[PDB]
Amino acid sequence: NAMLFCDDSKKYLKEQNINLKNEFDKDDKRVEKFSLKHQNIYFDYSKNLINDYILKSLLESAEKSSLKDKIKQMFNGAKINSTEHRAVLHTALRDLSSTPLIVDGQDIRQEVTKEKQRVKELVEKVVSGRWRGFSGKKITDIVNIGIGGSDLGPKMVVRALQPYHCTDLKVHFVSNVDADSLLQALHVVDPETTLLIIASKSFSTEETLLNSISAREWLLDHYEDEKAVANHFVAISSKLDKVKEFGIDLEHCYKMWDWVGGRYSLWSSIGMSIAFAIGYDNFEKLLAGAYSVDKHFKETEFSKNIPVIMALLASYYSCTYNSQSQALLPYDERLCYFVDYLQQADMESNGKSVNIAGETVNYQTGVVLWGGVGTNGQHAFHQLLHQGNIFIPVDFIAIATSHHNYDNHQQALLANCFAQSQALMFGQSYDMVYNELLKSGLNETQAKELAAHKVIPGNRPSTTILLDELSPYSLGALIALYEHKIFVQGVLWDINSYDQWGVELGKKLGKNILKAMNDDSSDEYQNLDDSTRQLIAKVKN
Amino acid sequence: NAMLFCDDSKKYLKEQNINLKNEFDKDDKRVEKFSLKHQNIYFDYSKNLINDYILKSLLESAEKSSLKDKIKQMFNGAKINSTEHRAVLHTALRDLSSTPLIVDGQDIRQEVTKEKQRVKELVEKVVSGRWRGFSGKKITDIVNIGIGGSDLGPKMVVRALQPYHCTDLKVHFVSNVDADSLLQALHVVDPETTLLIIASKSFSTEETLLNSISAREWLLDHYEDEKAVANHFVAISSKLDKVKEFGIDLEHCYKMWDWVGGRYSLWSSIGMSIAFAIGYDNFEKLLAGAYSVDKHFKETEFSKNIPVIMALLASYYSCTYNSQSQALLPYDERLCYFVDYLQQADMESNGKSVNIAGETVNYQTGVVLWGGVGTNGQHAFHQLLHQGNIFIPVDFIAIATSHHNYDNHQQALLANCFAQSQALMFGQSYDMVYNELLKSGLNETQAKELAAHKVIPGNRPSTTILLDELSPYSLGALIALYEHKIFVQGVLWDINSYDQWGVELGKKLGKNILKAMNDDSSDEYQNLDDSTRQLIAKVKN
Ligand SMILES: O=P(O)(O)OC[C@H]1O[C@H](OP(=O)(O)O)[C@H](O)[C@@H]1O
Ligand SMILES: O=P(O)(O)OC[C@H]1O[C@H](OP(=O)(O)O)[C@H](O)[C@@H]1O
Ligand SMILES: [Ca+2]
Ligand SMILES: [Ca+2]
């Protein structure tokens, strides 16, 4: 009996027939109405297909929903991950309020602070040269071993904050079970000067198991002494018992709690590889940026709340226009893994077919998130954004100031960013094109023939999110905005954003198939569908 | 009056209600019927929502269409890029047939062969050390400067064939106007030992202009002698006149013809950076692989023609199921830029709203292409593929044998690949889950409460394309399959796959905005919409 977001009312707000050009021409307060600021982030949603009436209707749905209660429940540690009976407390990992928070018998403020102090001490000991390898040498390289949430957030952040690297360590990310991943690291590191991190909440992920065992075999092939493990491995894991079976001391094991989802874990000890690149001070700045957005999100009325507006716009489009994807276009090379990261956060959260009560929902939930770095994407897929016939909401991320003095490059980068949202809004009509082709020197026949092919419909929506700079703090704020967008969408859809039951089956079938690959007399082999059986046969012959 | 692909007939083939499990159970010839082989590529489309009747209907549409004629027209050099009155001859770049081909007065076989011999000689002269920089030193680094089709194909191929690198040169790719891109190269190269490639068909792309000028300024800041340009720059361009204004001799200018689209250009002299990484012999192998697929595509009846089947399945889904995206999942780390590459090839080709006659089409055309490397994607977005409520066709790319001896890693990689397509097909029912939860130790209440959340609907389609290995030849074959898929889809939709008029407007608006940024009394500034005006104001303040 939760409120229905995608109802008849929404599907009919569309009938306002918003024309963006007309709105900007007639409403001199358009930008003021449909933009917000949070510190040095400017959120301009004024090129969206909205007016006052549509935004009001959307905000009413939010106000009528359980959202206000759910925000409080998330921050207070209520078990909002209902199918796993877990709290959802990535927010606590970056808290600066120091308000009381006791969850499941633990003082969360103490737990989080003490674990940060441990990671900080590890990083300082390694960077200072107090940590030595087994043969007595200073560490020069860090290799993170993990997949999904134990890989992508740290990898994305390390790249995004490349200008802030300052520890003299090189940080490498091993993830896929495809041994190419492990080999790219091993080919450029020395066992005597490398610290390996096993990043695994469960300590039983197939890929990370094989990678970690293989890395240990490489280390021990070199040293020929099991005692070397102590100087060359640390672990992060919620499952402290499996860490000791692998051979790692508790003093080299870092905590991860059940209330930290993998795809919300970069803020935890899982982010230690971030700290090993940019230093612990900068890691604190990253967390502080996120905290600023957490405070905004928790305290701000919905009509002025950036993540709530992001969520309402996205769910409005996917409900009313039946769009099945959203495009995210970061106009900075440093953000090259940002789409990949948000794919995980968004799609694994909101790709759900049942509501909290377990009922199959009759409305569409999470859509495909995709995109690409600008300006490059302009020469790859923006043709489709401009002249295709797919409805796709677009977010642009712009960074006002970069990390260098090529000011002509930076100005062109921004001009392009802004031109692309302007082009989506305006398009170009048959009459504009036809007249332009005549002025180019085409005769009437030629111009008539070509003009239709150059028509760009326009009236296509976008949001632009402008940062003053891409720093640890502003990046942390940017990520947190999207974390909260995703939460709001899940609440409005009445789904559990924080479980992931859909992946279990493939893990089981994978074990079965590996058995079938190694024994064709097995029940596993006999029960295969014939597509799977012949694929296995082809990778033997 | 072209044939309509997405007609009432198609929209109703859906009513067959294909159940994949039932089909594999009842049809012991399912795989034989719905798989094809081309040399050492195995194409298994048997997990698609098809049976004999649906495939027959689809093949009838292809047979009734202009496709047979259009294939001949493409290879013969007819002006199938109708809006630009151009031939479309990327196929000729890799030809091994040596059949007669005279287009626009040129002997295409002679033109292509002579240009290859020039690139081969350049690569040998640089690799051998006969090419010296201006101070007399051997080259160690190659920097490609280009964007879109002048960047992504070469970048993707160089990564994909990393195990085959053999020239002792490091190859770097500068593309975005964001100066981070140029700086990542300049920070690790020495002007005295670097050869720079300006890859630009037009020689007037904004980004490449700024990058090339900036690179020249860096070179000349070092040498302080304009004569050094001759030893440190080469150009690829269809526009030989602009190359000389930049300062580059014709002897250092490589050809590009109008009939080579940018997004089909890696096979041309634009691919020289590929050759500088893997050697010219391996570049020939890459072209030979593509040729093998060109011969397959041109000569094979439609029912056994892999690109035609790929196209029919894709357009069937996007017509009948109204899907708006397709997922491409390469199970090899080396293919990390393959989705990015195919996004350009597919979306910039088929993101079109008018037919060849210029009429607005009433059916959906090109959809969003996205995806991600496996197994990593399993921990990011496969949750949505399994339990979301979006219909998304899925292609898996598997490689039977890798480039190392971690056979346990490779077997797990493949088991996962096959498990994921198997999981999409089968899913898991409420009854299976409920019974499993009881056997796990949950009581009836608990199992009832959780079971619905673990239901995986299944009956979701996939294709698996299996290569024996990822070599220059097999990669070339793989890319060509998709080039021809895209061509077939465009023909069936009656669109021009080979123009890109939609990007022009944003280039114009970008020039206007840059003027507005530098002069607020300009007409450009006064004509801005207020969203654009305030974004410009915010990146000054
Ligand atoms: O080794 P651990 O950190 O336990 O798990 C690794 C990753 O696997 C999970 O994905 P999924 O839930 O399998 O889709 C998360 O992405 C998590 O970070
Ligand atoms: O410098 P040149 O090679 O002339 O062009 C660079 C790139 O720009 C084009 O994109 P679009 O047509 O602008 O979307 C192609 O991707 C081309 O390779
Ligand atoms: Ca209320
Ligand atoms: Ca026919």
Short mmCIF file of C-alpha atoms and ligand atoms in Angstrom, two decimals, chain B residues 63-65 68, ligand 4:
data_model
loop_
_atom_site.label_atom_id
_atom_site.label_comp_id
_atom_site.label_asym_id
_atom_site.label_seq_id
_atom_site.Cartn_x
_atom_site.Cartn_y
_atom_site.Cartn_z
CA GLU B 63 15.42 -11.52 -49.00
CA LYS B 64 12.63 -9.13 -49.98
CA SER B 65 14.74 -6.08 -49.16
CA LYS B 68 21.43 -8.28 -51.90
CA CA C 4 14.92 -10.96 -53.24
#
